[PDB]
Amino acid sequence: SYINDKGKEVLVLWGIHHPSTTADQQSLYQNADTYVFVGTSRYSKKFKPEIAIRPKVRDQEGRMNYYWTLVEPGDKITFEATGNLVVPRYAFAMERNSGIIISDTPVH
Amino acid sequence: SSFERFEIFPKTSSWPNHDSNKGVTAACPHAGAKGFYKNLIWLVKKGNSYPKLSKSYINDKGKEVLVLWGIHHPSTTADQQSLYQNADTYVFVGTSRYSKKFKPEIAIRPKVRDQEGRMNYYWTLVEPGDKITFEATGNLVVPRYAFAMERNSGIIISDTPVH
Amino acid sequence: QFTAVGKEFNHLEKRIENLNKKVDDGFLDIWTYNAELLVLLENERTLDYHDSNVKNLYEKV
């Protein structure tokens, strides 16, 4: 668990790993049927790993889904897992205010 | 800009362990008799077994390939077993970008065209050189015809004559 | 107004992407047309204004 003790919104990112085979699931987490739960005052979602062989992208037959949520100042974020959770190490405290530019133009 | 309908998984050679014929319904009649979609095959059990299906396609065309499939949801557990022989089934479809598992939701729905069951229709665009994979233990309405195309507009709803 | 014209939409959001384009192409057509005609109409008035001043100077002498 984490409590937002900062005076602003905290961006928390995590991942849910989906192995290619049941043997790959067991050699990483030892448990066959696993679950991940993430919850705040607003956010609440259970994650169930979908184990299957996907077409190879960067030598990988498995997939990893990336999830994010904004934790309100004073609000609490909770992580519960029996496997497959790519856990947060670094989060981001921020005050939001624009757009994004795709360019090769030099900065000055 | 460049549309082409082609047989992605040929009916004759693709499905040797599953039934390609018995997947017809009164909901989709052809010549007054039970039929189905032309571009899809409702794969049912052969004898009393539905082995683990695993089929793949590589986009050898010089453009995007539109692949459509279906996930069938039977009304009762008895209807599930008389079509696929397996109780708890799953369907998996994956590309370099796409990846989704399908679990059949077995329940009695209100009758639409004499059917208490439902069939969900899914699609994805396969990139030139990319691979599409189908894995199933039941309930997969498999593709027969796919579409090679170059995208460029809108859609008009009208009874005005064409000239 | 402070505005960021740029927007981003994925492969399954082409309808609202085209709605965004319709908004941009809509403003483009409105502004190009109004700006062009405004110039045409004001240049006429300016050259007419100079004509008046030269005439009202002759018709004072």
Q: Report yes or no: A99 and C6 within 8 Å, Cβ to Cβ.
A: yes
Rounded Cα gap, residues A57 and A63, in angstroms: 9
Comparing alpha-carbon positions, the chain C residue that sits nearest to A99 is: C4
Residues 6+ apart with CB under 8 A from B7: B144, B145
Q: How far is C7 from chain A (nearest CA, A)?
A: 7
Q: Tell me which chains share at least 3 CB pairs under 8 Å with chain A.
A: B, C
β-strands B40-42, B140-143 pairing:
antiparallel
Rounded Cα gap, residues B95 and B67, in angstroms: 11
Q: How far is C53 from chain A (nearest CA, A)?
A: 50
Measured CA distances, C61 to B46, C28, C51, C52 (Å) = 111, 50, 16, 14
Give every strand in the sheet of B91-94, ordered side by side: B53-58, B131-136, B91-94, B99-102
Tokens 């796409």 belong to residue:
B98
Tokens 């066959």 belong to residue:
A32
Interface test with B, best of A18, A25, A56, A57 (most B CBs within 10 A): A57
Comparing alpha-carbon positions, the chain A residue that sits nearest to B136 is: A52
Q: B95 to chain A: which residues are within 8 Å by CB? A: 55
Reduced to 3 states, what is the DSSP secondary structure of residue A103?
coil
Q: How far is A92 from chain B (nearest CA, A)?
A: 28
Can you give the resolution of this entry in Å?
3.1
Domain parsing of chain B, residue ranges? 1-163
Kindly tell me the burial class for residue B146, based on how many C-beta atoms sit within 10 Å of its own C-beta (0-12, 13-18, 19 or more).
buried
Between B99, B130, B131, which is nearest A63 by CB? Answer: B99
Kindly tell me the burial class for residue A4, based on how many C-beta atoms sit within 10 Å of its own C-beta (0-12, 13-18, 19 or more).
buried
Sign of CA dihedral B4, B5, B8, B13: negative
Q: Report yes or no: B93 and B57 within 8 Å, Cβ to Cβ.
A: no
Tokens 């004499």 belong to residue:
B114
Short-list B115, B116, B99, CA closest to B107: B116
In one letter, which amino acid is B107?
A: A
Q: Report yes or no: B137 and B90 within 8 Å, Cβ to Cβ.
A: yes
CB within 8 Å: B94 and A57: no
Comparing alpha-carbon positions, the chain C residue that sits nearest to A102 is: C6
Residues 6+ apart with CB under 8 A from A25: A19, A31, A32, A34, A49, A51, A83, A84
Residues 1-30 of C with CB under 8 A from A: 4-8
Q: Report yes or no: A9 and A20 within 8 Å, Cβ to Cβ.
A: no
**Which of the 8 DSSP states describes residue B162?**
P
Structure tokens at A64: 């990893």
Measured CA distances, B134 to A19, B141, B152, C47, C57 (Å) = 17, 11, 29, 74, 90
Q: What fold, for B1-163?
A: Hemagglutinin (Ha1 Chain); Chain: A; domain 1 (3.90.209)
CB within 8 Å: A55 and B135: no
Q: A52 to chain B: which residues are within 8 Å by CB? A: 92, 94, 101, 135
Tokens 């994010």 belong to residue:
A68
**Which of the 8 DSSP states describes residue B25?**
B
Q: C5 to chain A: which residues are within 8 Å by CB? A: 99
In one letter, which amino acid is B86?
A: N
> What does the radius of gyration of chain A's CA atoms come to, in whole angstroms?
18
Other residues' Cβ atoms within 10 Å of the Cβ of residue B89: 22
The H or E element containing residue A102 is none
Q: How far is A102 from chain C (nearest CA, A)?
A: 10
Q: What angle do CA B20, B131, B118 make, to 5 degrees?
A: 45
What is the SS3 string spanning B66-132? EEEEEEEECCCHHHHHHHHCCCCCCEEEECCCCEEEECCCCCCCCCECCECCEEEEEEEEECCCCEE
CB within 8 Å: C8 and A98: no
Short-list B100, B114, B46, B47, CA closest to B71: B100
Q: Which residues pair with B125 in a beta bridge?
A: B66
Reduced to 3 states, what is the DSSP secondary structure of residue A101?
coil
Kindly tell me the burial class for residue B81, based on how many C-beta atoms sit within 10 Å of its own C-beta (0-12, 13-18, 19 or more).
middle
At residue B70, φ and ψ (nearest 5 deg) are -135, 150
> What does the radius of gyration of chain B's CA atoms come to, in whole angstroms?
17
Tokens 């607003």 belong to residue:
A42
CB within 8 Å: C8 and A100: yes
- Read out DSSP for chain C? ----------TT-HHHHHHHHHHHHHHHHHHHHHHHHHHHHHHHHHHHHHHHHHHHHHTT-
CB within 8 Å: A63 and B96: no
Q: In sequence order, which ranges of chain A are alpha helices (DSSP H)? A: 22-29
Residues 6+ apart with CB under 8 A from A32: A22, A25, A26
- Residue A50, chain B, CB below 8 Å: the answer is yes
Query: For chain C, how many residues are written?
Result: 61
Short-list B80, B65, B57, CA closest to B146: B65
Structure tokens at B69: 């499939």
CB within 8 Å: A101 and C6: yes
Structure tokens at A23: 């043997």
CB within 8 Å: B131 and A50: no
